[PDB]
């Protein structure tokens, strides 16, 4: 009576092991545990979304509203939350778009599931309700698609793709951020129309260089790569033009050394007198063949000795240091050169072409300009990003990567397949699934009808973060979808969406004039990952933890 039996025969497992099952409201606590980090990403959704500050154990601060990036530095405890954490990371890697949608959609499916479990629905019937409703959801997305990107590159068409994606990440000015990203995309495209070749694109081609100081309006697009380097011998503006011939060596420039027990052997004083002048003639003979080919610049991948740098300054040859690997790999893609390990005369067919190499002060340090010109086009262009704070420079770099990943969505599928934006995609699916829930007899209609209710978070989040009442604005939007379709065709009511601030009362007419759209390839995987993330949590009846 004084002390409990304290769960007898509990010594079967270590004291650190704990057992949590769907019974005793723990499945409700798991859903309630999602709402703790769910509201964190709700205020970050949309162009009016709010960025968050997360301080790690090392002191690094990353300010971003992206749900996939924020969950990286955070330490997660509850096991089912890691299901939601790792689900948002896959969406960022695969499609590079729709990261905040997976975080919000998977969290709302568990919120509506709390009422489903309370009514007595078994975990098996709840899973079957979402799987049957998701298959109908993916089929309706292909029916509601409007427009297409058609040609690969266009000045106007690239403003309907990258611009609406970068509007949510660091909104700021619209046309300023859209022109910087859209310019670097046109350079890495092979074009070559009418040839019938298979298009190709690389998401790592465009590199963002973070340089503090200045302003966003002073940013520009550089066709070449930009590094922080100090020329050793001399600096040259290279005003003599006629372009240049450049060679790249992944191996360092120095006398070849034996990999085992390199040692100077001198038997007599006769060999010692010619040893000092012997090494000078070796580099002279090797560097003379390079200077005879007209090579004004040499790219090195490791440390170069001083004896090798002497003859390079004699013929006026620039010296570049390219540490590690990936930095040197993208240099040859600009000039179209093939590295070779030997120090001999390079092949003329493997030499690159760079017209000008300039060194100027941007952020206070000397940077080398690899920028290309109209002719002899180059690939893997870089974008100079100027900003006052380094924290803004980090997320804008990821904001540009979101636009670069959107270009990848123009390659694998048949086209761009633009979808109505401003939340109009998830709202139209509500009326279609509602009719789908009635067409299916049985008890499975409870999970199907509530599956469309979870799509109401998109219009409510955009309206709440915009400083508007969700009770006045949201029902007024259904008035366009409550009139169904008339006796005549050409119905433009599908373009209605949620507006931020302004005059409220729905607004922005039809979004076709706003030019903001969504990607179909993004919404396909965003719904599948978010559904499986909530399905995994609902499919686990018992959770076991260790040490805590």
């Amino acid at each position: 009576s004084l002390r409990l039996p304290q769960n007898p025969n509990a010594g079967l497992f270590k004291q650190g092991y704990n057992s949590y099952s769907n019974a005793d409201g723990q499945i409700i606590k798991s859903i309630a545990a999602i709402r703790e980090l769910h509201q964190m990403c709700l205020t970050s959704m949309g162009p009016c979304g709010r960025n968050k500050i997360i301080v790690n154990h090392l002191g690094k601060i990353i300010i971003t509203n992206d749900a996939a990036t924020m969950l990286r530095e955070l330490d997660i405890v509850h096991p089912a939350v890691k299901v939601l954490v790792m689900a948002t990371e896959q969406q960022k890697i695969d499609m590079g778009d729709g990261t905040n949608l997976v975080m919000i959609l998977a969290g709302e499916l568990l919120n509506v599931s709390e009422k489903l479990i309370s009514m007595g629905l078994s975990a098996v019937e709840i899973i079957q309700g979402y799987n049957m409703a998701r298959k109908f959801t993916l089929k309706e997305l292909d029916e509601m698609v409007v427009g297409e990107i058609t040609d690969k590159n266009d000045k106007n068409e690239l403003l309907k793709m990258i611009k609406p994606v970068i509007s949510s990440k660091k909104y700021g000015s619209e046309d300023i951020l859209s022109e910087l990203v859209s310019e670097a995309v046109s350079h890495v495209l092979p074009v070559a129309q009418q040839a019938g070749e298979i298009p190709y694109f690389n998401v790592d081609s465009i590199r963002v260089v973070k340089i503090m100081g200045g302003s966003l309006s002073n940013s520009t697009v550089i066709k070449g790569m930009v590094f922080n380097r100090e020329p050793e011998g001399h600096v040259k503006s290279l005003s003599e033009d006629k372009k240049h011939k450049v060679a790249v060596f992944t191996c360092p420039l120095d006398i070849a050394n034996t990999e085992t027990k390199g040692t100077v052997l001198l038997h007599n004083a006769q060999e010692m007198l010619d040893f000092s002048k012997g090494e000078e003639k070796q580099i002279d003979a090797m560097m003379k063949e390079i200077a005879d080919m007209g090579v004004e610049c040499i790219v090195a991948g490791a440390g170069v000795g001083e004896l090798a740098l002497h003859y390079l300054n004699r013929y006026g040859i620039l010296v570049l240091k390219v540490p590690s690997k990936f930095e040197l790999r993208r240099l040859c893609r600009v000039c179209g050169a093939t590295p070779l390990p030997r120090l001999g005369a390079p092949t003329p067919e493997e030499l690159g072409l760079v017209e000008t190499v300039k060194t100027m002060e941007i952020g206070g340090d000397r940077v080398t300009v690899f920028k290309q010109e109209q002719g002899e086009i180059s690939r893997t262009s870089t974008i100079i990003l100027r900003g006052a704070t380094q924290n803004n420079l980090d997320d804008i770099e990821r904001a540009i990567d979101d636009g670069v990943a959107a270009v990848k969505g123009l390659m694998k599928p048949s086209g761009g397949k633009l979808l109505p934006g401003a939340g109009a995609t998830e709202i139209e699916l509500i009326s279609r699934i509602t009719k789908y829930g009635e067409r299916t007899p049985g008890l499975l209609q409870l999970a199907i009808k509530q599956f469309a209710v979870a799509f109401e978070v998109v219009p409510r989040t955009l309206a709440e973060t915009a400083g508007l009442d969700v009770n006045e604005v949201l029902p007024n939007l259904y008035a366009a979808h409550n009139v169904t379709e008339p006796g005549a065709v050409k119905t433009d009511h599908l373009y209605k969406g949620v507006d931020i601030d302004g005059e409220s009362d729905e607004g922005v007419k039809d979004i076709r004039e706003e030019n903001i759209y969504d990607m179909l390839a993004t919404k396909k995987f965003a719904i599948n990952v978010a559904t499986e993330a909530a399905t995994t949590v609902l499919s686990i009846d018992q959770i076991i933890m260790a040490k805590k």
Binding site: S1, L2, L4, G25, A32, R35, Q39, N111, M119, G120, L121, L443, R460, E464, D469, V470, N471
Partner: protein, 520 residues
């Protein structure tokens, strides 16, 4: 400085609303298994060591220490239902806990202000009382056969349902004895005496009108059986009275000290002569009795009982009709107890028990309960009080309402028709009460082992046919109406359960901050 020494840090906004709703739901979740005829039992461990095993809602809440401040308000809700009525304390927390559970996706989702919801909860409370009044039907309050089936409503859940046939005869005569004409019967639990005697059989019991005392006789010669007993209550002790003035006597002559002890013996004999004036057969006092006053009453045959409980003397005056008089000089034949009979002291090894049988309308009765153990006997005591509380509201008002899932669903159907006709900002919070009334009938199915999905789906379709008598069976879970099986409960139990849940929901939704450290 530190400024405020009490909770200088503050938790406000939606974080304080979630902590109030989650803690309130945990109060109702533990008692979900305590509802229904198949309901389980809960054991509680106090720091004193006494074990309390019961399915009652109030007995579980008041004995559990909750550290959550707002969840403590849920603990006192059952006290409101227990003190005013005493039946239905479990359904109050289940309903109030479901309201906040259903009202949660509003401030977080719909962003509706609490006062806007409060205005909808008050309007839904008025309409709920009208639906309960319409489904209520009057019955005869003077029918003994009809009141036996009404007491079985609260007994069907309790373990005493096996003795329910015997238990109804015990609770029926108990309420009818203490009630009198005057606010109608004005019956009070304080007049009903429930004595707990360990051992015996539950099947063997009887309602005794009188006071059962555990005190033995003060003298062996005292007759333990009197044909025509006469009870005279005296608050003054038979021991020699000492003045509070602390009188100090200075003794000089040799005959002064011997006279003091004689006068002390003369007054004790004098006080006995004042008692013998009316010649009572019995004497009952609440204080000690001296050994000198015992012999003087042996000649008159006055049986004396000492150290009687103060509240028991008022219960003796009701059955015996005697008037309590402190001084022996005012004793008259009218103050002597009359009409009392069957005075006998039964010999039991544990204690000596005294019996009284009655032949100014206020009376009293002592129910002797014989259990199998002291802790089970404590359960029958609690079950007997809740059984007699059902007959109280039946005698107060003729109104009688259905129960067992019929009343809760009858309100939710009426709330669904008016909700679609509102078309306003209050439509969303008005629908929360309709879904809140569903927890009670849904809990009855989950505890019965049935499927709440298919039963509640067809249940709402029945109420749309125009009959409010469709309930839910506790055993088979059938949709058969409650008129066949006969479940009926007073309307006061249904009203006090709905009124308390609405008033409690508005209290916790208005708390935007939780601070501690005041130490008043």
């Amino acid at each position: 400085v530190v400024f405020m020494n009490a909770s200088q840090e503050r938790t406000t906004g939606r974080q304080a609303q979630i902590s109030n709703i989650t803690a309130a739901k945990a109060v109702a979740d533990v008692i979900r298994t305590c509802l229904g005829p198949k309901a389980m039992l809960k054991m509680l461990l106090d720091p004193m060591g006494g074990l309390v095993l019961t399915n009652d809602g109030h007995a579980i809440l008041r004995e559990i220490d909750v550290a959550h401040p707002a969840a403590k308000s849920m603990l006192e809700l059952s006290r409101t239902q227990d003190e005013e009525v005493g039946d239905g304390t479990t359904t109050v927390i289940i309903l109030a806990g479901e309201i906040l559970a259903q009202c949660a996706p509003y401030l977080i989702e719909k962003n509706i202000h609490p006062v806007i919801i409060i205005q909808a909860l008050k309007k839904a409370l008025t309409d709920a009382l009208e639906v309960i009044k319409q489904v209520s039907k009057p019955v005869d309050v003077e029918n003994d056969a009809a009141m036996k089936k009404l007491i079985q409503a609260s007994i069907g859940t309790k373990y005493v349902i096996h003795w329910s046939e015997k238990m109804c005869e015990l609770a029926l005569d108990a309420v009818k004895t203490v009630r009198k004409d005057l606010n109608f019967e004005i019956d009070i639990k304080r007049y009903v005496r429930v004595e707990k005697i360990p051992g015996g059989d539950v099947l063997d019991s009887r309602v005794l009108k009188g006071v059962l005392l555990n005190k033995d006789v003060v003298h062996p010669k005292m007759s333990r059986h009197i044909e025509n007993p006469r009870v005279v209550l005296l608050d003054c002790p038979l021991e020699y009275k000492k003045g509070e003035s602390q009188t100090n006597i200075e003794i000089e002559k040799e005959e002064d000290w011997n006279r003091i002890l004689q006068i002390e013996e003369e007054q004790v004999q004098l006080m006995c002569e004042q008692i013998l004036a009316v010649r009572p057969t019995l004497v009952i006092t609440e204080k000690g009795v001296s050994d000198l006053a015992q012999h003087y009453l042996l000649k008159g045959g006055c049986s004396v009982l000492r150290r009687v409980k103060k509240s028991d003397n008022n219960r003796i005056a009701r059955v015996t009709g005697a008037t309590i008089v402190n001084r022996v000089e005012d004793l008259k034949e009218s103050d002597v107890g009359t009409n009392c009979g069957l005075f006998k002291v039964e010999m039991i090894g544990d204690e000596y028990f005294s019996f009284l049988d009655n032949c100014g309308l206020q009376k009293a009765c002592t129910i002797m309960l014989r259990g199998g153990s002291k802790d089970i006997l404590n359960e029958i005591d609690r079950n007997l009080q809740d059984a007699m509380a059902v007959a109280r509201n039946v005698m107060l008002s003729p109104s009688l309402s259905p129960g067992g899932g019929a009343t809760e669903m009858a309100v939710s159907v009426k709330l669904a028709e008016k909700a679609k006709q509102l078309e306003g900002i209050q439509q969303w919070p008005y629908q929360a009460v309709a879904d809140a009334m569903e927890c009670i009938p849904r809990t009855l199915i989950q505890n019965a082992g049935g499927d709440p999905i298919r039963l509640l789906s067809q249940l709402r379709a029945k109420h749309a046919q125009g009959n409010f008598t469709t309930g839910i069976d506790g055993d088979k879970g059938k949709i058969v109406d409650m008129v066949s099986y006969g479940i009926w409960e007073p309307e006061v139990i249904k009203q006090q359960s709905v009124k308390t849940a609405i008033e409690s929901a508005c209290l916790l939704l208005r708390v935007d901050d939780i601070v501690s450290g005041v130490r008043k």
